[PDB]
């Protein structure tokens, strides 16, 4: 959040914050309300978002779930929707939070080297995070469609 | 002249 | 590690980011800010050679390491293995690596005195190679070596003056040449 | 003290830093005479080239009288 | 640094003066141009690496520059380039926000020039992809935004010139 | 100005002045006539409140005017006077420009050395910045007055 | 070369040469011939290496060579094709070499940086510079093929 | 004390005490005699300095006095004066221990904090410490007077 | 650094032989001068605060160089210029307390009349600023003991000149 | 820096081309000269410190450069020098063991003529030091190897002058 | 001289010369007239001074001149005869200079690498300062002894 | 040893050691026989190669046992026997060992304070251990010779 990263900033300057820090954290404050409607909007359809979003990613990149992919099997591809899942959440916490803090903290520091470890794409879990943009702004306005989609470019970029 | 061995 | 901020000069023209990045250093190396230390600020000229650009921030810092204040605050009143912790914790960001470094360390405490341990510890690759030229020095929190990691993390969590015991006065040698 | 002011130009061989970095590649500081040949030897070490160097500071062959 | 707020303000300071009508008007007109400029400006972060990515495309690629014994060759040396012109454009971005070419001067031009003379950096294909990268700029940020972020262009290559 | 400090932020973060910055830059640009206003309400009546402020801090803080103190002689008053006008007119440019970057630039950095070479009472200067705050304040419309009293108690907060 | 790291690495410790590296300086030198004839081997069939890898890759990964991707065309195709003549002969300079550090240099550093502002996918190049590997060592004997998959797996797992 | 002066800018540079040192303490010790004297011809006359220092202090700045001034109320009289007889013992240990490191130690550093927290001028009260000088130099011997003003002078201009 | 004693000592070193006559008598002259020096540095730094004070008050204060405009206006130039009077005094009291004036171009004049040239600091300004300095410090301390802290002084006015 | 292989590699690299005959013919010969290269490396590891005691005794010692007024004179001068010659012999057996001068180029060349003038330092004497660390090691890694040690050493001289 | 490292250790402080460098210089200055007559006395008396030593060193230690040290030749006996009259020089030298910085830079730091290169017994030269000390006490009073013996034992401590 | 160095080499970039550092371990571990060998040779020897090498010592540098030497008697030559064998001894680690590593963490790791506070000459001992080399390669194959003469030379080399 914008009051955490102001205050780490006070702290390491070892000062009250600045007006500007503080008529930054009202602005913030203001657009919290439109943040968690955008939030909830998400929330609320959390399985259509990542069932629309897998079925749009499995018909461009068919081989990961043929026979032989890394999400063939049925336990497979609900382990794929489960990633979906995850980062579908922090989307949200991000939007929550108004930052793309909690998404880098949570599911994006050293993600490379997770799914290089378990034999995942990358540039497969990045056309999901485009699928669930893709899917959300559809089923959202054009000013909140570009508000979320701030912060899914912003994982989609840090997967590739 | 010496040193004490 | 993830909540702080790393204070870099990148210039010298915006005289307020130089005055927040001096007392930055002041913070990281006395660990406190020197209004209660000092009767007057000792380190003007060091804060008049940075702002006109003429010496870096690895300078300064080597010029607050090289100065009576750190001698009075982490030197006076600790024997020589305190103070290559403190001093390692103040410059380096962490700990003692191992008994090599220890054992250097104490060399140069012992042959050169508190200014040549700054001086080495300061020009040393290590430092150029995490903070670089212009990057005031920050906590670290190293992975490895073996114990540095502990041993950083037990020299960062007590504040000043919290004990006068030792976190790492020396690594026992498993194997004991000789 | 016999200060040099050295202007050196200290290239990046391993990483490519996003950030502003004129303040740390091309510099003209000032270091004492002790700490000088460390400061050079890590300078030649890491790649960089010594623009130029100079006693800024000092008289040269000064026999006594060099603090 | 000093933007037109900035720099309207410290022309008032100079004489030790209050603000009065010419710099009121100063300060309507950089208010009034405001709009462009953010606008300008968010559409540049928005897209300032395909900027980039055409901008190099369209001067130094398949060219003696790329080839080797250029100072391009080299993966390094490429995305020297290609960190360059991120510097440039960001700088250029800067300076188009703010409404004064005095970032520049003080971040970007100070100490380039012969930074490059030392490196062996060619500066008249710098000038070059500063160019291309004023072109792209103003045929995708429209016409008054493009030539605002064109003189500032124009600005650094000056600078390197 | 709100757009260099915002400038300087994402220099420092090496970013391209994320939307965060730009809508609040945007805000700024679009009622900067009301802050424009207050301009031109703190600076036409600038001596008026200028005297009461003096007044106040004379009646609160005699002694500095008494022969033992500093600002005696009707000519060290004239002084304390005219730092009063200066420390307004950096008011004035502070709420022009947005921030306060001219504040600090101007007559902040270092205003301790620059009391404690003429002998002055600090905190009386604060005091007095406090009492042309207060008339202020009294002067301007409700919620003006509390836009210029951020940057007023900003100078008194550097100031003590 | 081993040469070059063993003094870098005596000239950080501000030392001579141990006994023990100039016995490994011997054995390099010795093994020179064996390196060289490696050398041969892969610049003389360097075109049809390069045909034969480019073939593969292309029928393993059409999507870069199908219409919209990074090498569609016949231009595109002979760009990749340069490449791949171009990490060739990075392979063999590291070969002669006796280590990594030229091939490193030359072609290593900042690549991700490099393909990513080209938009061309760095997983396809590794499969290429991994197809390459294969031709290689089914042109050239076991031993030799042996010391050249060092440099080729660096070249792949650093990129990849 | 120089003794534990010495001791310490010794063991900066890890070695003995260097002959100049050495030459000192021996000054130092041998003259502690006539240091106990002023010792006690300072300590003997304590109120009477105080009274006059601080009555001569109280109407060369009346402001000290002054309505709204730091000391209006007779209780802060009598307050500056216990601040007086503090600073007085700490320059009697000073002489006696022949260093002015008793000095920095007790009352001196953080004096500014001191002064600023509590609102006192520092210059009014180095002037204190200043007419405490002229009166212990009128009521002592000539070179007493000069021995117990190098530590006075020392106070007042390193203080102020 | 080198005082008097160290400067006889290094010109006997340069010809590495043992103090002859001249030397002789140029130690017994800086021997003799210690006496006067010694107090002469007590008594400056007595009121060295205050002597920079009413030196700046009769020479810089009032003045257009502290107005709007001037290169004093604003507080921390002022105190940046207060920092170098400051300097300026008790590297001249170093000086004069070692009889040489190496510490003097050695500390106070590293690149000091470049930096005021670029920086743009007003160099008549700043001499007038010293010899103010000098006047009061020689009515301070007194004719004699004031000529050799003012041969330092102007040391300082050379070297910035 | 650089050894004969590496710079074989950049030579060709940077026109762009594999290693032709005249290349691996160069590798061939720095291969073959590795042996004697790593047999004189291991008798200057051996006597390092002896060849710069002889060197300087019959460069240096007893002359006008040791004596009271030299630049060598001083237990510290005479310390610096004897450091400077033992970092120019073990840089010069680095460039014997890479077969190439770039390090001496980039590690002992850089920054030192200038550091020389600076400090006033005789570059006439020093060459001669020098050319005794170039009979000393001659006397002793042999005339085969002497060679090749003392082309170095004439680089790090020819550099120097 | 004692001025030199008073000033030296104010400027690292950033203070002016506190009371005891004061006394400290002023007690050098009134007792420079025994420091000359201690260099004058040394500078007649040396040649027999140091020859004395020498010959006491050659009693201590015969293997220095035996054939085979580094003493032994006519030469390299005078060349011991030269050294011991450049540091009975620097004992002058540094006794009227009140400390011994010019004995630590310029025949005291860096003593040891020049004896190392050159071979000398440099616990051998330990001896022979001793002897020059015993000599010097021989010859001068014995109330002066105390002074030359203090950089006598400095010189011996710092260099054995 | 060779494979302690190996490991500790790899250690410092983090990874697995190279083909190599491995073919190196490999060659020294199928070759290990003549250096154990060798080892035992010099060993059985001992007595002898220590009993020549000190009176080629002592004929060479007789000043270490003449008067004002270092070992006078036969008790201090029977001391110099002794850290002779140490250094043999030491010799000996090394060469079965394979790299000199052991003989710094021996005997070569503060032996300059060693031989400084024992007033040894530090010269006459690298000459001791030349004729150890001397002797040493006399008793045996030129080859292992040179094999043994690698450690002799390293330890010669940290004596000077
Ligand atoms: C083919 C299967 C893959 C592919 C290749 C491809 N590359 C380019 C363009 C360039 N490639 C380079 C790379 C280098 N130049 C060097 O000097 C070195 C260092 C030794 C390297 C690695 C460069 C510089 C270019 C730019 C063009 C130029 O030659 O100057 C292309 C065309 C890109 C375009 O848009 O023109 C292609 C197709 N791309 C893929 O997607 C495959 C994985
Ligand atoms: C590219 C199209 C052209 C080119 C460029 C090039 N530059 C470098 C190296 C550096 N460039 C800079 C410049 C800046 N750094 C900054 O922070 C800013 C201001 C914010 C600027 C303008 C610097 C400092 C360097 C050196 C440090 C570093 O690499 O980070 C290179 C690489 C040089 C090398 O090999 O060392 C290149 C290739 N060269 C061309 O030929 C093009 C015309
Ligand atoms: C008199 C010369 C000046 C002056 C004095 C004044 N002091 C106070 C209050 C305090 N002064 C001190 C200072 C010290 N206490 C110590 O123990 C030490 C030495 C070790 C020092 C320097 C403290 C601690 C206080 C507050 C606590 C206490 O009084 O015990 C006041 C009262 C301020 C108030 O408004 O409350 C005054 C007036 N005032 C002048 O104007 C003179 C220049
Ligand atoms: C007044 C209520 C308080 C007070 C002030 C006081 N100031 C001066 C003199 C000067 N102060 C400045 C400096 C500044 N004034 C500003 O507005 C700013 C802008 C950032 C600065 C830095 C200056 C320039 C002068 C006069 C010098 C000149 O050239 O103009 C005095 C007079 C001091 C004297 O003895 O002359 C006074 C009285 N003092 C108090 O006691 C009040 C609390
Ligand atoms: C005062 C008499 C004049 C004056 C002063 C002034 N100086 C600066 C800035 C600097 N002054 C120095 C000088 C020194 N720094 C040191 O450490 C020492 C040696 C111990 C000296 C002599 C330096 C280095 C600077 C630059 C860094 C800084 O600002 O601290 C200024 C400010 C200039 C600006 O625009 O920032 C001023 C005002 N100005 C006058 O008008 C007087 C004549
Ligand atoms: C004599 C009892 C001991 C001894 C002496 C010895 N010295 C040399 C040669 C030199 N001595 C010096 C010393 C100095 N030069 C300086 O400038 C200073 C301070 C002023 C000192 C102390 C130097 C520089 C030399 C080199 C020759 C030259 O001056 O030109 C020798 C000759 C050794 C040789 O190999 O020629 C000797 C014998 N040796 C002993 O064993 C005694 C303990
Ligand atoms: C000896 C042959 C000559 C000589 C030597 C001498 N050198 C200095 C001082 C320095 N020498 C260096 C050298 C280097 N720095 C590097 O990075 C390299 C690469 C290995 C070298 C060779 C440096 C940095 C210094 C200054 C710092 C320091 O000395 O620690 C001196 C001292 C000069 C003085 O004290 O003023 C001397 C005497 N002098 C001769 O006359 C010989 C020709
Ligand atoms: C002690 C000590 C040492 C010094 C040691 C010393 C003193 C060493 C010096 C030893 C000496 C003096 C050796 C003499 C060697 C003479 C030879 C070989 C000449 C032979 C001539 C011949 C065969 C000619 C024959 C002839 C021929 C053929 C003719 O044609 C006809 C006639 C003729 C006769 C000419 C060291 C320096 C080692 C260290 C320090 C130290 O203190």
């Not at chain 3, 993830?2 to 307020?16: A, I, P, W």
């Not at chain 3, 020095?137 to 540095?148: D, E, I, Q, V």
Request: aromatic share 10%.
């Amino acid at each position: 959040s914008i009051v955490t990263k102001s205050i780490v900033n006070a702290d390491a300057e070892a000062r009250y914050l600045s007006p500007g820090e503080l008529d930054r954290i009202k602005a913030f404050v203001t657009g919290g309300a439109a943040r968690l409607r955008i939030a909830e909007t998400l929330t609320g359809s959390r399985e259509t978002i990542v069932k629309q979003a897998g079925d749009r990613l499995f018909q461009k990149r068919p081989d990961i779930v043929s026979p032989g992919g890394n999400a063939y099997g049925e336990e497979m591809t609900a382990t794929c929707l489960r990633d979906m899942d995850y980062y579908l959440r922090l989307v949200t916490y991000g939007v929550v939070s108004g930052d793309v803090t909690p998404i880098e903290e949570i599911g994006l520091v050293g993600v490379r080297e997770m799914y290089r470890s378990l034999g995942t794409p990358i540039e497969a879990v990045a056309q999901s995070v485009r699928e669930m943009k893709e899917v959300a702004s559809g089923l959202m306005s054009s000013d909140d469609a570009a508000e979320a989609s701030a912060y899914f470019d912003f994982v989609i970029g840090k997967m590739s | 002249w010496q040193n004490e061995v | 590690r993830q909540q702080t901020k790393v204070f870099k000069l990148v210039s010298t023209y915006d005289k307020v980011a130089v005055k927040n990045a001096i007392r930055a250093a002041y913070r990281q190396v006395f660990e406190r800010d020197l209004e209660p230390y000092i009767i007057n600020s000792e380190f003007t000229a060091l804060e008049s050679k940075l702002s006109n650009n003429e010496i870096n921030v690895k300078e300064f810092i080597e010029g607050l390491g090289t100065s009576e204040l750190y001698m009075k605050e982490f030197y006076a009143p600790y024997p020589n293995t305190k103070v290559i912790e403190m001093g390692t914790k103040h410059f380096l960001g962490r700990a003692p690596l191992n008994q090599k470094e220890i054992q250097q360390y104490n060399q140069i405490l012992a042959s050169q005195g508190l200014k040549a341990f700054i001086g080495a510890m300061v020009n040393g690759m290590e430092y150029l190679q995490t903070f670089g030229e212009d990057t005031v020095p920050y906590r670290r929190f190293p992975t490895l070596p073996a114990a540095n990691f502990p041993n950083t993390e037990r020299l960062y969590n007590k504040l000043t003056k919290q004990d006068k015991e030792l976190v790492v006065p020396s690594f026992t040698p498993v194997v004991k040449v000789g | 003290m016999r200060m040099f002011r050295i202007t050196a130009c200290v290239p990046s061989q391993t990483r490519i830093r996003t950030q502003r970095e004129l303040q740390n590649t091309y510099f003209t500081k000032l270091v004492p005479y002790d700490n000088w040949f460390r400061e050079q030897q890590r300078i030649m070490k890491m790649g960089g080239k010594i623009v130029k160097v100079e006693l800024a500071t000092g008289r040269p062959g000064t026999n006594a009288g060099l603090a | 640094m000093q933007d037109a707020i900035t720099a309207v303000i410290n022309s008032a300071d100079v004489q030790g003066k209050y603000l009065d009508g010419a710099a009121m008007d100063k300060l309507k007109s950089y208010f009034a141009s405001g709009e462009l400029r953010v606008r300008a400006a968010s559409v540049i972060s928005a897209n300032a690496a395909t900027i980039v990515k055409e901008a190099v495309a369209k001067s130094l690629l398949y060219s003696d520059v790329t080839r080797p014994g250029g100072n391009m060759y080299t993966t390094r040396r490429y995305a020297a380039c290609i960190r360059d012109l991120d510097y440039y454009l960001r700088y250029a971005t800067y300076a188009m926000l703010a409404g004064d070419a005095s970032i520049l001067d003080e971040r970007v031009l100070n100490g380039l020039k012969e930074t490059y003379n030392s490196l062996g950096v060619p500066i008249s294909s710098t000038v070059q992809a500063i160019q291309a990268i004023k072109e792209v700029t103003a045929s995708l940020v429209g016409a008054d935004a493009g030539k605002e972020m064109g003189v500032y262009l124009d600005y650094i290559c000056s600078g390197l010139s």
